[PDB]
Amino acid sequence: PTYFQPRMSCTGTRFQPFMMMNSPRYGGTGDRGSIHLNREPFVSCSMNECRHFALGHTATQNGPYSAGTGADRSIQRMLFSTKLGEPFTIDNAIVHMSGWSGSACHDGVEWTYVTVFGTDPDALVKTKYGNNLVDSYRSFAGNILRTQESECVCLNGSCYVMITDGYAGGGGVSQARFLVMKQGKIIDVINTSGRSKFTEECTCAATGNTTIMCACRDNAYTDRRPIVAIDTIAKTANVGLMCSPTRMDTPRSADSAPSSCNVDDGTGGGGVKGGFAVVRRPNGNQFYYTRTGSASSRVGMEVRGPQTEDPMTGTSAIPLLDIIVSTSVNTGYSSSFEMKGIECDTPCFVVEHIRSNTWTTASSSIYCLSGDASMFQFDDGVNPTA
Amino acid sequence: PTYFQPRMSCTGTRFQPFMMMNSPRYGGTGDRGSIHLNREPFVSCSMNECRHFALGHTATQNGPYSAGTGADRSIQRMLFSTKLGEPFTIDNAIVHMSGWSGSACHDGVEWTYVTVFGTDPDALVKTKYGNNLVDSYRSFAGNILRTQESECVCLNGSCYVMITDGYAGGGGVSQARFLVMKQGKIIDVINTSGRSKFTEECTCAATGNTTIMCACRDNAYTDRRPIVAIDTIAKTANVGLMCSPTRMDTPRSADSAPSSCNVDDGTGGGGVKGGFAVVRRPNGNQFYYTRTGSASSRVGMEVRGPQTEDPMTGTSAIPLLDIIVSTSVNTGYSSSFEMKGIECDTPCFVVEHIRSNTWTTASSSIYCLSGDASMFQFDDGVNPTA
Amino acid sequence: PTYFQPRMSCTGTRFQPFMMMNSPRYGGTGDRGSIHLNREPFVSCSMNECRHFALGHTATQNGPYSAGTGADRSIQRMLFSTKLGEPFTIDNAIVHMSGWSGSACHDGVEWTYVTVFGTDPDALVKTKYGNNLVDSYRSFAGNILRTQESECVCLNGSCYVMITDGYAGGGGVSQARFLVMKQGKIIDVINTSGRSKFTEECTCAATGNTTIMCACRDNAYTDRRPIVAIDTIAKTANVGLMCSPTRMDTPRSADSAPSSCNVDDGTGGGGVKGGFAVVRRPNGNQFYYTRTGSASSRVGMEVRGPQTEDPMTGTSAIPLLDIIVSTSVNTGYSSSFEMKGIECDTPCFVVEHIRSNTWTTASSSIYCLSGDASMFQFDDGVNPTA
Amino acid sequence: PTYFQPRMSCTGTRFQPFMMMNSPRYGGTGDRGSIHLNREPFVSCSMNECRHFALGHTATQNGPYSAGTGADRSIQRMLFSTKLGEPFTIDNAIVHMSGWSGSACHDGVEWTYVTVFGTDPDALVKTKYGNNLVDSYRSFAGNILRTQESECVCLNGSCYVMITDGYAGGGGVSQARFLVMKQGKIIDVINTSGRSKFTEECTCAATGNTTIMCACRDNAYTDRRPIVAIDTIAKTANVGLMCSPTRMDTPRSADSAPSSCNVDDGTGGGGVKGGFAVVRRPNGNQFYYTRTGSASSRVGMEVRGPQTEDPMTGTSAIPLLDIIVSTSVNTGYSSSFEMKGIECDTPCFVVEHIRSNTWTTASSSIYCLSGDASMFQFDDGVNPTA
Ligand SMILES: *[C@@H]1O[C@H](CO)[C@@H](O)[C@H](O)[C@H]1NC(C)=O
Ligand SMILES: *[C@@H]1O[C@H](CO)[C@@H](O)[C@H](O)[C@H]1NC(C)=O
Ligand SMILES: *[C@@H]1O[C@H](CO)[C@@H](O)[C@H](O)[C@H]1NC(C)=O
Ligand SMILES: *[C@@H]1O[C@H](CO)[C@@H](O)[C@H](O)[C@H]1NC(C)=O
């Protein structure tokens, strides 16, 4: 009835610091806070509220169960969120469902949540709409089934969420599929084509009505991100590697043009989830990317400036816009979301900060498209031994 | 005006792990949480929210009053709940009324709460609707008056809650009655017939408009659960023992057919509240049951697959569907609830986990009907000496 | 527009235990809770929610400022409340305004709050409506200005709150006035007549449309409570002493008839706020009273049964209905409130329990009109040295 | 659609104690609370709720990060608020955006938030409306960009917020500008005229429809506050110094008339944000001011009585109304806000109290226009070493 449709983005040229959800700063052995242990934070917004989602380990930052929370998958993993702006404490967190992998988005009416939970070789995808469980999808490759770990994209009520299934190591194949949900019910599945061989942890944004574009991870063959062009009328997802000389993954080789756009050329396997933002304008879209600062290590964070060429076939270099996190500060996964205002959408990037001692926590820094001003780089301010 | 009526259930063949309300995992002597001490958790849902209900002891998990909270009845017992997904902490819990036994349900308009509180030989049932106390019912057998300890069933505004009163030991008689409430006011009382001799801790689900079916406990004569068929037009509750060779109580004898359906045959007295779910379909209902894993002890938990025969007179064995809790993990009471979605209902089972040191707490695991996938068995993850 | 008017009470013959807001049971030096230090708790209800109000000392139960919280008046006193059913913790409490004396009620549209704050010889009454400060009233006798410390009574939008001002010791005069507020604005002041000499801490309930009756304290001359009959059309408050042989204050002499209804006869000064409930029926009102158990000390608590004679001029004894608190448990102030349901009102009594070590706290027990059942007496369960 | 417009103020002659948001009184090394470290608190109100805003340091009152929170600007600074009446704890606080300087107000529909964040020589102003980031404004003088640190004024949807940029020391120039926002979008900028040389930390109140008046700080040349008269139709802000002999800043010289109204005459640089309230009446406006008690030090707090002459050119002395904080209690910044009731507005002053040990916190005392009664002076009651 009132389903959200993408709008043109508002005026701005830089992604300026907006909010820091540095949850594990009100905890520590010398403090009084009770904070969730989690990984892979992301933000999704409705037109009235933004929420900060994460996968927790059902344990406090400084508690008897904090050991063992560095695991990627466990039966204690759950998807939970708070409103953006809340400290992300145990009392403020709302658990949506169990799951060691997941995503969430809002269609303009109600929140849709997607998680993956189960045994590694046979995990199940479950979808929930409005606190009522709606649907499920079974593992298709016989390997760890994974989601975006970021916001899913809703177009007039149809929400497109990426799922993948396959071996994430060298020599593996991980062909992604996009589930199309309406009110949490899976109505369609769009399989990939093009360089479908390995698509993982896709960060997606709308490129206008009827079209979605994603920038994904490749953890086995290259260090150039796959770009997935989803045509929702043709019902096809065309995957290919960025032909740009600027490499967006971590580890990565020195920037250079590929000999051919879809040839595997890089440092080998491994990778990090990255950011991807689209600034939609009446005269064409501009694309922005996040990259770690130091090549070969998840240190620092840069924003690569507007690309006016197709992210797949442009072949031009992507200029540096700003350095948002210095190389003295460790970083993790990067994602993106859009605020949905009264008149326009506002692209924002989310930068993960990883902190550990005898437990592992995540902190997030949100940078939103705004006006031109000198960058004020952010240090998480979390001391694992505080 | 907008009273809820049962709907057909959605597609699914397995009860897959959904959410674990393992409240006493953010507490412990080494943590900073303040968590209620409680027993007999259950979940009830509205179409917009699900709530997790429990009977507390007005004490924290690790506090000066934690001793003595293993009692079944005390004047400090109270009925309280949080939204499903909340940690069930002291600050999130809302107390509804005092009571050492109780149930709750939502009729599509507002929440109805039922508790029993008073002296053992002369306890009083009280009903509340929408935070306003509405009605009461007095003890009828001169013994401990008890409720379902699970969700009550509302049919177009009329909510059916089980109450029982009698000696729970060997040689006792405990004849149940069903109170029919409308807006919390008791409008009718349906007495039982058939094997009315001992009916306790009934887990009820609708079997369609105008009909409710319950699977109850028998703690004195047998190890086969009583099944109560409630005809809301005829205003009769027909009770009889499951004629199936599969015995659902704990302790229980090895599975075997009874010599006659309502003959008392088993290991003697004792028992546990069990689960009972109905999958309503246009071509007939399917019934699902929970059972402990190890016969003679409350260890593990199994889900017994669809029974297409009448739960009372079928006489066929009920196949094993899944083992949801391994026998290395202790379990307690089992119950069931239904989520009420936009298009359909979703049957879910709730499995209690009991943990104690110098206090006693309960944790709950929720398994909801979903798609076919390998089972991922759950270990509560609560260390009484954490 | 939707202002509340009194309704007939529902069926019942006993005030049965309903809820215990024993806030200082989740605190203590061995616990993790942060609970307000307060005195004189009372409950007021809207048709959708009940709230528990108290005057706090802006300090935690076990904190660096807990010393000195036994004071009756200080600049750190504030009026705050939580929803009835909440633990009344620091995080759940909402502060309404500063004040060392106060009352609150709901008119069917929004909450009206009244407090007294200022210097003893020249304190100010302030009224607030809907979080916006509306009006004030200045001290009139040059002595400590006081309120009811209980729910104010709203009749079709006009809310009647008692204020008094005078010396509370022997030989003093404390003539009460009733402020009539509409949307928090003081529209009228009704002065008292009859035995106006000393009226304090009035517990008021409606006796039907256009009429309010209160049972007050007399802390200087007698041990019989003043009864105030407020005629809202005549705009008069007629005060006189209960002519009944049953004495409701503490300390009190042995029950005996007075030689004349308004002659000062008793144990001298001192007193306690008491309960007063009205069961409105089509054939006349019934009155119920609370009394301490042990005469001469605030120990235990009794409910004195229905009085069908005018509370002022009846002259008959008031029979004992139930003993609600045993004499092994210390008690404090008693008050009353009414729940406002869909069809009827439900009179309820609130019994204060006082606990102290190096701080002073209050706990409250709520007993609501319900069916006939044996009484289950309540022990606060709060250990000052827990 | 429903945008707020100023109303006439209600009856009253004194600003009487209303509420004390003494947040750091439920914390301390001996307590269990987790309270934000912050500075420059202020209150802004909607017609349904009042909120207490502050700039935090993302640290608890008694935690591992409490050192270093006495800084005026840092990357850990954020704007957050709670409802007025809440303890302002970590769990109740909602973070709106990052920022080391800011303001907030409500236009009758939704909350507008303004902050300044960035590097000192090139900071950015950002505006947010309804949890969605809307606009920004860049530094204009090449120096620290600052906001009011108090409520912004909304007239029929147009919200007027003061920003300034310049050197705050001796010999500096700090010319203010007023941004006019509608739904968070900056629609106009009104530059100042008159004694535009140094305008800072303006406390603004409406003087009627189409007009706003502010009393500002001057931290370099004088100890008389600048008054800014904003004509929203002429779109001009006329700045000049108070010609009154009563000096409102701190430090200040002994009261005396200036030789000429806009001649710099005082004790030199330095200053404190002060209060400014307007009582709008059909026969003209009255102005009220706050002043510290002890000249030359931020000790105590006085309210200077109604000024019926133009605050700029009156030249008469402003009589003392009340002493609201004694000189035994240290004070900080003062501001003002208006409650928006059903029929009228209610001017209120907010008095900051500064407390520090190894951390710095702020407490606030709210005094609202009410009736005539003897003043009850307030001592914060916060012990830095509690
Ligand atoms: C999508 O379509 C809507 C109208 O249905 C329009 O208002 C909006 O601007 C469009 N967005 C884009 C990005 O084209
Ligand atoms: C109950 O009746 C309603 C119509 O009143 C119908 O929509 C619903 O499907 C029925 N449910 C069952 C289980 O028969
Ligand atoms: C008060 O008047 C209303 C009608 O205005 C009526 O419904 C209600 O029952 C009356 N209450 C009493 C106690 O007479
Ligand atoms: C402002 O104008 C409105 C009508 O638009 C009026 O009701 C209000 O009283 C005016 N306020 C002042 C202060 O003049």
PDB file of C-alpha atoms in Angstrom, chain A residues 58-197:
ATOM      1  CA  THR A  58      24.430 -14.226  23.418  1.00  0.00           C
ATOM      2  CA  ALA A  59      27.173 -13.007  25.759  1.00  0.00           C
ATOM      3  CA  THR A  60      28.275  -9.769  27.392  1.00  0.00           C
ATOM      4  CA  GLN A  61      31.439  -7.855  26.536  1.00  0.00           C
ATOM      5  CA  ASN A  62      32.920  -8.652  29.986  1.00  0.00           C
ATOM      6  CA  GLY A  63      31.234 -11.844  31.165  1.00  0.00           C
ATOM      7  CA  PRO A  64      31.677 -15.550  31.868  1.00  0.00           C
ATOM      8  CA  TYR A  65      30.776 -16.522  28.276  1.00  0.00           C
ATOM      9  CA  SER A  66      32.956 -13.992  26.453  1.00  0.00           C
ATOM     10  CA  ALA A  67      35.556 -16.629  25.565  1.00  0.00           C
ATOM     11  CA  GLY A  68      34.872 -18.308  22.239  1.00  0.00           C
ATOM     12  CA  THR A  69      32.992 -15.345  20.725  1.00  0.00           C
ATOM     13  CA  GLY A  70      35.536 -14.968  17.911  1.00  0.00           C
ATOM     14  CA  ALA A  71      33.855 -17.871  16.107  1.00  0.00           C
ATOM     15  CA  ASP A  72      32.247 -17.158  12.749  1.00  0.00           C
ATOM     16  CA  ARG A  73      29.369 -19.623  13.220  1.00  0.00           C
ATOM     17  CA  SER A  74      27.876 -21.141  16.351  1.00  0.00           C
ATOM     18  CA  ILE A  75      24.475 -22.163  17.648  1.00  0.00           C
ATOM     19  CA  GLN A  76      24.551 -19.190  20.032  1.00  0.00           C
ATOM     20  CA  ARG A  77      24.591 -16.721  17.140  1.00  0.00           C
ATOM     21  CA  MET A  78      21.510 -14.543  16.831  1.00  0.00           C
ATOM     22  CA  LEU A  79      20.391 -11.521  14.810  1.00  0.00           C
ATOM     23  CA  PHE A  80      19.516  -8.509  16.938  1.00  0.00           C
ATOM     24  CA  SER A  81      19.193  -4.760  16.572  1.00  0.00           C
ATOM     25  CA  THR A  82      18.628  -1.450  18.305  1.00  0.00           C
ATOM     26  CA  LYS A  83      17.537   1.910  17.017  1.00  0.00           C
ATOM     27  CA  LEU A  84      20.409   3.804  15.498  1.00  0.00           C
ATOM     28  CA  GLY A  85      21.677   6.129  18.218  1.00  0.00           C
ATOM     29  CA  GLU A  86      21.228   3.675  21.121  1.00  0.00           C
ATOM     30  CA  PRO A  87      24.286   2.279  22.943  1.00  0.00           C
ATOM     31  CA  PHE A  88      23.557  -1.297  21.672  1.00  0.00           C
ATOM     32  CA  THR A  89      23.417  -2.648  25.239  1.00  0.00           C
ATOM     33  CA  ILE A  90      21.929  -5.923  26.432  1.00  0.00           C
ATOM     34  CA  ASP A  91      18.756  -4.173  27.626  1.00  0.00           C
ATOM     35  CA  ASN A  92      18.204  -2.177  24.412  1.00  0.00           C
ATOM     36  CA  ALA A  93      18.911  -5.046  22.017  1.00  0.00           C
ATOM     37  CA  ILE A  94      15.950  -6.901  20.514  1.00  0.00           C
ATOM     38  CA  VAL A  95      16.609 -10.417  19.218  1.00  0.00           C
ATOM     39  CA  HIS A  96      14.828 -11.152  15.937  1.00  0.00           C
ATOM     40  CA  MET A  97      15.737 -14.827  15.422  1.00  0.00           C
ATOM     41  CA  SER A  98      18.661 -17.204  15.677  1.00  0.00           C
ATOM     42  CA  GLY A  99      21.237 -17.063  12.926  1.00  0.00           C
ATOM     43  CA  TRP A 100      24.947 -16.993  12.188  1.00  0.00           C
ATOM     44  CA  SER A 101      24.461 -14.991   8.974  1.00  0.00           C
ATOM     45  CA  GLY A 102      21.837 -12.413   8.097  1.00  0.00           C
ATOM     46  CA  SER A 103      20.437  -9.226   6.602  1.00  0.00           C
ATOM     47  CA  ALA A 104      17.463  -6.921   7.120  1.00  0.00           C
ATOM     48  CA  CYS A 105      15.591  -4.159   5.309  1.00  0.00           C
ATOM     49  CA  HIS A 106      12.333  -2.190   5.410  1.00  0.00           C
ATOM     50  CA  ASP A 107       9.909  -2.069   2.448  1.00  0.00           C
ATOM     51  CA  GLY A 108       8.052   1.085   3.519  1.00  0.00           C
ATOM     52  CA  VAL A 109       5.468  -0.840   5.584  1.00  0.00           C
ATOM     53  CA  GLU A 110       7.263  -3.307   7.875  1.00  0.00           C
ATOM     54  CA  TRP A 111      10.696  -4.793   8.542  1.00  0.00           C
ATOM     55  CA  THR A 112      11.842  -7.920   6.705  1.00  0.00           C
ATOM     56  CA  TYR A 113      14.590  -9.990   8.336  1.00  0.00           C
ATOM     57  CA  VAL A 114      16.597 -12.770   6.674  1.00  0.00           C
ATOM     58  CA  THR A 115      18.987 -15.104   8.468  1.00  0.00           C
ATOM     59  CA  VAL A 116      20.883 -18.304   7.769  1.00  0.00           C
ATOM     60  CA  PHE A 117      21.092 -20.878  10.561  1.00  0.00           C
ATOM     61  CA  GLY A 118      21.893 -24.577  10.584  1.00  0.00           C
ATOM     62  CA  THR A 119      24.690 -27.059  10.107  1.00  0.00           C
ATOM     63  CA  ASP A 120      27.462 -25.919   7.726  1.00  0.00           C
ATOM     64  CA  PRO A 121      26.768 -28.502   4.959  1.00  0.00           C
ATOM     65  CA  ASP A 122      22.973 -28.043   5.222  1.00  0.00           C
ATOM     66  CA  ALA A 123      22.024 -24.625   6.611  1.00  0.00           C
ATOM     67  CA  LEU A 124      18.579 -23.053   6.187  1.00  0.00           C
ATOM     68  CA  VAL A 125      17.673 -19.494   5.169  1.00  0.00           C
ATOM     69  CA  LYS A 126      14.661 -18.188   7.068  1.00  0.00           C
ATOM     70  CA  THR A 127      12.703 -15.003   6.459  1.00  0.00           C
ATOM     71  CA  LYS A 128      10.543 -13.127   8.947  1.00  0.00           C
ATOM     72  CA  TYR A 129       8.187 -10.211   8.312  1.00  0.00           C
ATOM     73  CA  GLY A 130       6.813  -8.090  11.129  1.00  0.00           C
ATOM     74  CA  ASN A 131       7.814 -10.462  14.004  1.00  0.00           C
ATOM     75  CA  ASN A 132       6.007 -13.357  12.211  1.00  0.00           C
ATOM     76  CA  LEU A 133       8.129 -16.049  10.550  1.00  0.00           C
ATOM     77  CA  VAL A 134       7.135 -16.245   6.861  1.00  0.00           C
ATOM     78  CA  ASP A 135       9.395 -18.405   4.701  1.00  0.00           C
ATOM     79  CA  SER A 136      12.566 -20.430   4.217  1.00  0.00           C
ATOM     80  CA  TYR A 137      15.036 -21.503   1.521  1.00  0.00           C
ATOM     81  CA  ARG A 138      17.303 -24.559   1.690  1.00  0.00           C
ATOM     82  CA  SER A 139      21.042 -24.804   1.007  1.00  0.00           C
ATOM     83  CA  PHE A 140      21.745 -25.418  -2.689  1.00  0.00           C
ATOM     84  CA  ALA A 141      25.515 -26.126  -3.010  1.00  0.00           C
ATOM     85  CA  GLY A 142      26.125 -28.362   0.023  1.00  0.00           C
ATOM     86  CA  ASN A 143      28.413 -25.837   1.737  1.00  0.00           C
ATOM     87  CA  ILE A 144      28.169 -22.912   4.143  1.00  0.00           C
ATOM     88  CA  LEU A 145      25.129 -20.855   3.128  1.00  0.00           C
ATOM     89  CA  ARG A 146      25.689 -17.099   3.572  1.00  0.00           C
ATOM     90  CA  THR A 147      23.841 -13.763   3.243  1.00  0.00           C
ATOM     91  CA  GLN A 148      24.969 -10.181   2.451  1.00  0.00           C
ATOM     92  CA  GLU A 149      25.677  -9.150   6.063  1.00  0.00           C
ATOM     93  CA  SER A 150      24.171  -5.809   4.968  1.00  0.00           C
ATOM     94  CA  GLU A 151      20.908  -4.120   3.999  1.00  0.00           C
ATOM     95  CA  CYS A 152      18.653  -5.847   1.443  1.00  0.00           C
ATOM     96  CA  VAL A 153      17.064  -3.657  -1.265  1.00  0.00           C
ATOM     97  CA  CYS A 154      13.280  -3.145  -1.463  1.00  0.00           C
ATOM     98  CA  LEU A 155      11.661  -1.852  -4.681  1.00  0.00           C
ATOM     99  CA  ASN A 156       7.924  -1.133  -4.332  1.00  0.00           C
ATOM    100  CA  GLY A 157       7.515  -3.967  -1.851  1.00  0.00           C
ATOM    101  CA  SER A 158       9.786  -6.526  -3.541  1.00  0.00           C
ATOM    102  CA  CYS A 159      12.913  -7.037  -1.420  1.00  0.00           C
ATOM    103  CA  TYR A 160      16.043  -8.461  -3.045  1.00  0.00           C
ATOM    104  CA  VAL A 161      18.408 -10.312  -0.693  1.00  0.00           C
ATOM    105  CA  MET A 162      21.612 -12.069  -1.771  1.00  0.00           C
ATOM    106  CA  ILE A 163      22.344 -15.627  -0.662  1.00  0.00           C
ATOM    107  CA  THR A 164      25.379 -17.683  -1.658  1.00  0.00           C
ATOM    108  CA  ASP A 165      26.503 -21.243  -1.021  1.00  0.00           C
ATOM    109  CA  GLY A 166      29.881 -22.822  -1.675  1.00  0.00           C
ATOM    110  CA  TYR A 167      33.438 -23.355  -0.542  1.00  0.00           C
ATOM    111  CA  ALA A 168      35.055 -20.040   0.385  1.00  0.00           C
ATOM    112  CA  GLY A 169      38.667 -21.249   0.016  1.00  0.00           C
ATOM    113  CA  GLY A 170      40.988 -21.619  -2.929  1.00  0.00           C
ATOM    114  CA  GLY A 171      39.580 -23.534  -5.868  1.00  0.00           C
ATOM    115  CA  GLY A 172      36.026 -23.152  -4.587  1.00  0.00           C
ATOM    116  CA  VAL A 173      32.886 -22.110  -6.422  1.00  0.00           C
ATOM    117  CA  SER A 174      30.287 -19.874  -4.742  1.00  0.00           C
ATOM    118  CA  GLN A 175      27.469 -18.980  -7.128  1.00  0.00           C
ATOM    119  CA  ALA A 176      25.084 -16.434  -5.647  1.00  0.00           C
ATOM    120  CA  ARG A 177      21.315 -16.265  -5.975  1.00  0.00           C
ATOM    121  CA  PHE A 178      19.005 -13.352  -5.185  1.00  0.00           C
ATOM    122  CA  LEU A 179      15.779 -14.129  -3.366  1.00  0.00           C
ATOM    123  CA  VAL A 180      12.876 -11.819  -4.178  1.00  0.00           C
ATOM    124  CA  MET A 181      10.539 -11.513  -1.195  1.00  0.00           C
ATOM    125  CA  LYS A 182       7.174  -9.787  -0.828  1.00  0.00           C
ATOM    126  CA  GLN A 183       5.913  -9.450   2.763  1.00  0.00           C
ATOM    127  CA  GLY A 184       8.607 -11.977   3.690  1.00  0.00           C
ATOM    128  CA  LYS A 185       7.297 -14.634   1.292  1.00  0.00           C
ATOM    129  CA  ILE A 186       9.834 -15.692  -1.310  1.00  0.00           C
ATOM    130  CA  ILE A 187       8.120 -15.012  -4.631  1.00  0.00           C
ATOM    131  CA  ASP A 188      11.088 -15.480  -6.938  1.00  0.00           C
ATOM    132  CA  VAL A 189      14.722 -16.542  -7.177  1.00  0.00           C
ATOM    133  CA  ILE A 190      17.074 -14.828  -9.637  1.00  0.00           C
ATOM    134  CA  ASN A 191      20.175 -16.868 -10.389  1.00  0.00           C
ATOM    135  CA  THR A 192      23.407 -15.253 -11.516  1.00  0.00           C
ATOM    136  CA  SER A 193      25.139 -15.278 -14.895  1.00  0.00           C
ATOM    137  CA  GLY A 194      28.363 -13.795 -16.202  1.00  0.00           C
ATOM    138  CA  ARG A 195      31.275 -14.443 -13.832  1.00  0.00           C
ATOM    139  CA  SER A 196      28.990 -16.374 -11.504  1.00  0.00           C
ATOM    140  CA  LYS A 197      31.877 -18.541 -10.217  1.00  0.00           C
TER     141      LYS A 197
END
